[PDB]
Amino acid sequence: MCDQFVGTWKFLSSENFEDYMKELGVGFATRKMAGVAKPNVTISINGDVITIKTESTFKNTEVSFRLGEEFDETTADDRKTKNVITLDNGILNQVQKWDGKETVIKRKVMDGNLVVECTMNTVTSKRVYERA
């Protein structure tokens, strides 16, 4: 149980991410780039501010929030979102809303794997990173 969020993680595998992005409405080309990328995600904490830094990908991002507190974000595929992240039993639950629509991204540490599961409507993807 030193297996906590804080850290850097290296992409390992992916399942169904193509159809999850189709569901989000991401363009054919941006989907291409997202499916070849092998991102590194670094999560850090300072006081009560969490910073998720996504690197080694086609467009690097960085998002800082407090749990329970609404934030704005322009995503890598250029949506203008509203978000609320909360935490429960080790799982960070992110509800991201834009133009009437919603996706839920959940992240949980499993033995130095970070497992990120994204759902929108009917469609789920799982991505697995490993502790760099």
Ligand SMILES: CCCCC/C=C\C/C=C\CCCCCCCC(=O)O
């Ligand atoms: C953010 C990862 C970089 C590779 C995909 C790139 C950009 C994403 C663009 C459109 C769909 C959003 C995917 C990222 C979801 C949270 C990260 C993850 O599932 O880990």
